[PDB]
Each structure stands twice: as C-alpha cells, then as structure tokens.
Amino acid sequence: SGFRKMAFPSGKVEGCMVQVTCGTTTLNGLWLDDVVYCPRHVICTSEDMLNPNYEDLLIRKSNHNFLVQAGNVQLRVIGHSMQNCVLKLKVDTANPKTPKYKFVRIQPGQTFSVLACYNGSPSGVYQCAMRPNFTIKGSFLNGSCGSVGFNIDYDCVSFCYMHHMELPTGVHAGTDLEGNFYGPFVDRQTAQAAGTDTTITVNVLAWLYAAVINGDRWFLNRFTTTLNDFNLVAMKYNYEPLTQDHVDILGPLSAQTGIAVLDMCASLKELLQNGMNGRTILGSALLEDEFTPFDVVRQCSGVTFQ
Amino acid sequence: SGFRKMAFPSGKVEGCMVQVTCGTTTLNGLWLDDVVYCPRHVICTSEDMLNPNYEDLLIRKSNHNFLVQAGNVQLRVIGHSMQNCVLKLKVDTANPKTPKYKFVRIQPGQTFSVLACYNGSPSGVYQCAMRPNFTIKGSFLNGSCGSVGFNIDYDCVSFCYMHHMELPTGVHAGTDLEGNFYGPFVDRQTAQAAGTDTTITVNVLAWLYAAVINGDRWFLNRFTTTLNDFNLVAMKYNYEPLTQDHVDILGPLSAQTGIAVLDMCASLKELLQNGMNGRTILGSALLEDEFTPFDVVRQCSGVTFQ
Ligand SMILES: [Zn+2]
Ligand SMILES: [Zn+2]
C-alpha cells in the first residue's frame, strides 16, 4: 500500500551522461552508441542567444572544438551535424553502457522521469508530465541543459525529452531527441509566453482510482454524470475535455475497483465544484494530474525493469 | 528555477539489489562486498509472522537454503548470521558493482531516497522522510521487503533504511542496516499503532525559503515572532518544537534570502492560523515537510554526485 510520485530507476541513463563544452559553454550530452546528442545552443555565447543564426555559428566550429568528457575520460569527436535543435557529435568509441533504447515523441499529458545533471554528473531524478501547453514544470538551474527525460519498459529506455530553455515565467521547454521542440518554443532568449496550463483530466481520474485502491475514499458520492455533462464542468475549470478514448484507457482501473468511469467523473465534478473542504487525498490537498492511468496500474501492481 | 521532490540517482544502489529466497518466501537483498543483507523474516511463512521465534526458525536453515540471485546469476552462500532483525548472508563473490558506502542510522525528520524493488529488480525511486513517530510514508507492495533507503554524498552511498513491515494503518516500518527497527516496531504481524504524526517544522521552514528563492512569495508578511511564541502555535498544530539548533541550521537560507528565521516563522504562524486561502506554494496546497534544509540548499545550488 501507499502511493508515491515515483521516477524510473535512473541507472541506465546515468551511464549515458557526458559533459559537452564548446568555447566557454558547458552543458550535458547523451552518449548512445557512437553518438553524443546535445542542445545546439552549446555553440552560443550568452550574447548569441538573443538572436542566434545557428547555421552561421556552426560554420565556425570544427570537430576539435567540441570537448566531450565522460566522467574522467575524453571522447574523440570525428564528426558533427545539426538536426533541428540538437547537435549529433560522432565519437570514435561506442558507449559500453548503452542501454537498449528508443527515441519517442510523447503526447501532452504523458509522464516521464527527468535525470537532472550538471557538468555531465547526475544530481537527482524526479517525475513530471508534458503539460497540455507543451511546457514541463521541472527543476533546472544553469548548466542543466541537455538533461533528458525518459520512460523505461523492462529493459528498453525510451528517451522523450532534452532540456533546452527556461521561460521567463519559470517553466521549462525542450525537444525530443530528434531536436524538435515540444510546442511552439524556440531556442532563442525572446518573449515566449505559455498558453493555458490546462489540467490533465484523465490523469486526475486515474489518481482518484489510485486513492480508492489505497483506502482514501471520502470523496466517493452517490452521483453519476455523462461525458457531455462532465465536460461542461471541465471547461469551466480549465480541465481537458474527457473523450471516450480516455474512458476506455481507464477501463482496467474501473474493472479492478468496480467504480464506473462516469461515477468517478461525478466524484471529480463535486470536488471541482465544492473543493476538498480542508481534506487530503493521497497526501495532497489538490487534485493531482501527473500520474497517467498506466502509471497507476504500474505502481499498484509492482512492475519492475531489467 | 523550479523546485521538485527529487530522489538521488539510483544507479549505484541498483547494482546492489539481489533476490533472496528461503523456502517459499522471496524478497530483496542488498549485496555489498561479499555480504548480502536482507530482512530476517525471509525465513518465515505467512503463518510464522503471527508469533515467530526467529532463533528457533533459523536453526532449521542451512546456507544452501538461502537462494540468492543477482539478475541471472546465482550466488554461492558460504555463511549466514542474524544481526538484530537482519540476516547477513556471506557469499563467495564480492559484488563488482559495490559503491563506496556507509551504514547510517538517521534521525527523525531526515529525508532519504527509496529504491522500490520486487524480485530483486528495481521498480522506481522516490523521496521520503523518517517521520517523528519513526514510520515512513512509502509505496510498498508485497515483495518489496528488503528495498532500501539511502543518501548519496558525491561518491559515497549512506544506507539508512531497509523495509520490513506495513502497519495496518498503511504506513511503513523498517530497520537500519544493522537490523535495528526505527521506533518501537517489531517484525511480527501484531497490533502496532503509530504515534502522532507530527509535522517537521524545520523542514517546512526550509521549504518556505525554497519557495521565496523560486518566486512564490505571497505568504511573506509584516510580522515577526519569538521561538517561545512560535512554539505555542507549533504545539497547537502538532508541529515539532523549533529549537535554536533548528534556527542555526536554517542560517544559510536566511543569509541567502535576507529573511530572518524568526520572520519566516511568523509567515508560517499566519499560514497555520489562517490556512492557504485556496492558494498554492511550489505547486502544493499544504505545507510540505519532507525537504530538509540541506535538501533545499542542494537543489537550489545544483550539487552533483560522482
Ligand atoms: Zn542552456
Ligand atoms: Zn515481508
């Protein structure tokens, strides 16, 4: 029993973290097989980030300008190229600690673990979610760029996020491992406002199921609702509209607990309209939306990873 | 910027996890040098846990009855002994992945990371705290016994917790790595009620400093207080009494932010007496007490680990 915000074990990713330095700028890179992936703004000075022309800046860089250090060992760079907003540094040595891995572009509402790193060294691991407005709410100080987000399925690490930017509002933006930003953001120090931070309804419901499974049940009520009726309430409270696809994904949790998805929606409706009256659910005083239905099933059954 | 509940990178501990089976019972062990540490109730049947005589049960076990598997490899057990509530299985092979390590018995209010494991395989990592009543609020399903809690200082893993028991109230009890339970709990399936779950005042204050550093400032007020006056309020709200030792530990955070410890206490006093009026601090709608002052300084400065 008990339910915690839980990150994936980070060892497989720790073995892939390297330091990348170009000129006066040092951030983190990801070493997989014989390629190191890092944010392209490693080639920028602080002044460059106001309006960088990355293709022109990269013309002034050669392979030997990219200093790559894996712990104490220096890696030899034998090629470099830019793919969207990431650089791919080809090195002459395959990472012997390369895990089975994939690159995946995640959807808003999906969760992943972040291994915060500085100077190529891991600092901590935590869980977060791709917000509907394509930001993440992380913990990143200067030097953390190139830290990555990931999911693990048994023995395969699916890399989904590379950190690039902090918005002036303190939220975070980054890319997939193909270098494409999530959302409209760009690797330029400019005005970039985030859209509405909408709540991930299907994740709140999954978390309510997790609560019931663990004995927090005070919020269950005698009511039901419909998708269209619930969504009128979701709109009022800046929740994502619930779809039948979401209802289907919650099916296993509905089956396990015997609480129909729409009955749980009616519990959520009352919590939105009335608040939590000074009480808590799973140690939280607000509705938590960074557990997916798959996260809940995983933690409530005890799935492991090779 | 940003502040997250962050666990230590778990790779060093992942390399120490093994599966231990005795008879029909399987849990987790910790393999360090040529010793495997696990809960002694691995020798119990479910029936035994109502009133086990561990010394009598262990007389019926030989070295070959302790099956120890590190991933796919079987370890050869060449000796066994009981130390308090843990078993020490001597094996014929030193763990080649043994990190620099220490065993430490932590104090209530201190935090640590837990690597939840099943069948010797890591499942997830999360942060938690030793509660003042010597329980922890974890995420442990059947099979998770022998999972460990730990802190990391640069390259040295300080192991502080081994999981043994879930109380009927759903909280968790365990031992240090010398086998001594935290608090009054015993490895017997009996009536064991936990004392008052008191809030860790010094940690709440540290977290308020973290909030200010990150721009959440609405709760600062025009007031101050004294230690004795604040503690009258702490008592009313089941908070730990604040001592001058706590004030001293918060000194660096006071110095950095320019907010005197007792002024922050007056902010906390008002939050306790008036609530949070439907607002949030660092994404929480309640006062968070599982960040230590050292946790806050670490995450706000970006310390890493070899
Ligand atoms: Zn950067
Ligand atoms: Zn057990």
Burial, A214: exposed, middle or buried (Cβ in 10 Å; 0-12, 13-18, 19+)?
A: middle
The full length of chain A comes to 306
Report the C-alpha gap between A181 and A103 in whole angstroms: 14
> Which of B6, B13, B207 should be substituted to probe chain A, the one whose Cβ sees the most A Cβ atoms within 10 Å?
B6
Is the Cβ–Cβ distance between B143 and B163 less than 8 Å? no
DSSP string, A174-201: EE-TTSPBSTT--SSSS--------B-H
Distance of CA B204 to the CA centre of its chain: 17
Report the C-alpha gap between B91 and A275 in whole angstroms: 56
Report the C-alpha gap between B277 and B301 in whole angstroms: 31
Report the C-alpha gap between A66 and A62 in whole angstroms: 7
User: Cβ of B6 under 8 Å from any chain A Cβ?
Assistant: yes
Residue A25 token pair: 């700028």
Q: Which of residues 197-216 of B touch A (CB under 8 A)?
A: 214-215
Pick the CATH number of A11-89 from 3.40.190.10, 3.40.605.10, 2.40.10.10, 3.10.450.50: 2.40.10.10
Min Cα separation A160/chain B (Å):
18
Q: Do B9 and A139 touch (CB under 8 A)?
A: no
Is the Cβ–Cβ distance between B114 and B159 less than 8 Å? no
User: Parallel, antiparallel, or unpaired for β B100-103 and B156-166?
Assistant: parallel
Min Cα separation A56/chain B (Å):
31
Phi, psi of B151 (to 5 degrees): -125, 155
**Residue B181 parent element (H or E):** none
- Residue A176 Cα to ligand 1 middle (Å): 15
Is the Cβ–Cβ distance between A247 and A202 less than 8 Å? no
> Which of B3, B8, B10, B281 should be substituted to probe chain A, the one whose Cβ sees the most A Cβ atoms within 10 Å?
B10
Report the C-alpha gap between B81 and B202 in whole angstroms: 40
Minimum CA–CA partner of A119 in chain B = B304
Distances (CA, A) of A230 to A136, A215, A241, A276, B11: 26, 25, 9, 18, 44
Please tell me whether residue A284 adopts helix, strand or coil conformation: strand
In sequence order, what are the beta bridge partners of B26?
B21
Please tell me whether residue B128 adopts helix, strand or coil conformation: strand
Min Cα separation B59/chain A (Å):
32
Count CB atoms within 10 A of the CB of residue B185: 20
Is the Cβ–Cβ distance between A68 and A89 less than 8 Å? yes
Please tell me whether residue A44 adopts helix, strand or coil conformation: coil
Distances (CA, A) of B30 to B106, B129, B186: 18, 21, 21
Ligand 2 ion: nearby residues, β-carbon < 5 Å: B 145
- Residue A207 Cα to ligand 2 middle (Å): 26
B11-89 matches B201-301 in fold: no
Minimum CA–CA partner of A70 in chain B = B306
Residue A117 token pair: 């790193």
Q: Please, which experimental method was used? A: X-ray
Residue A275 token pair: 């608040």
- Reduced 3-state DSSP string for B159-174: EEEEEEEECCCCCEEE
Is the Cβ–Cβ distance between B167 and B149 less than 8 Å? no
Of B7, B116, B301, the CB nearest to A126: B7
Dmax of chain A from CA atoms? 69
Is the Cβ–Cβ distance between A107 and A79 less than 8 Å? no
In which residue are the tokens 């409209």 written?
Answer: A184
User: Cβ of B144 under 8 Å from any chain A Cβ?
Assistant: yes
What is chain A's percent helix, strand, coil content, to nearest 5?
25, 30, 45
Of B123, B126, B141, the CB nearest to A5: B126
Residue A207 token pair: 């978390």
Phi, psi of A294 (to 5 degrees): -70, -35
Residue A23 token pair: 């000129």
Residue A172 token pair: 């975070």
Q: Which residues contact A224 (CB under 8 A, 6 or more apart)?
A: A260, A262, A263, A265, A266
Report the C-alpha gap between A213 and B271 in whole angstroms: 32
Resolution in A: 1.5
- Reduced 3-state DSSP string for A241-283: CCCHHHHHHCHHHHHHHCCCHHHHHHHHHHHHHHCCCCCCECC
Q: Do A215 and B170 touch (CB under 8 A)?
A: yes
Encoded amino acid at A66, one letter = F
Chain A residues inside the 8 Å CB shell of B128: 4
Please tell me whether residue A91 adopts helix, strand or coil conformation: strand
Beta-carbon-side half-sphere exposure of residue A10 (alpha carbons within 13 Å): 30
**Residue A158 parent element (H or E):** strand A156-166
Among residues A116, A157, A153, the alpha carbon closest in space to that of A136 is found at A116
Residue B75 token pair: 């370890």
Q: Which residues contact A154 (CB under 8 A, 6 or more apart)?
A: A305, A306
Phi, psi of A83 (to 5 degrees): -120, 110
Distances (CA, A) of B34 to B31, B75, B79, B81, B88: 7, 10, 10, 13, 10
Of A140, A142, A302, the CB nearest to B123: A302
- Residue A147 Cα to ligand 1 middle (Å): 10
How many H-runs (helices) and E-runs (strands) does chain B carry?
8, 13
In sequence order, what are the beta bridge partners of B51?
none
Is the Cβ–Cβ distance between B122 and B139 less than 8 Å? no
Report the C-alpha gap between B299 and B214 in whole angstroms: 11
Please tell me whether residue B14 adopts helix, strand or coil conformation: helix
Of A122, A172, A304, the CB nearest to B121: A304
Is the Cβ–Cβ distance between B164 and B54 less than 8 Å? no
In sequence order, what are the beta bridge partners of A181?
A175
Q: Whose atoms come closest to the Cα of B46: which ligand?
A: 2
Among residues B290, B213, B222, B214, the alpha carbon closest in space to that of B254 is found at B213
User: Parallel, antiparallel, or unpaired for β A100-103 and A156-166?
Assistant: parallel
Tell me yes or no: is domain A201-301 CATH 1.10.1840.10: yes
User: Cβ of B117 under 8 Å from any chain A Cβ?
Assistant: yes
- Residue A170 Cα to ligand 1 middle (Å): 14
Encoded amino acid at B71, one letter = G
Dmax of chain B from CA atoms? 69
Count CB atoms within 10 A of the CB of residue B209: 24
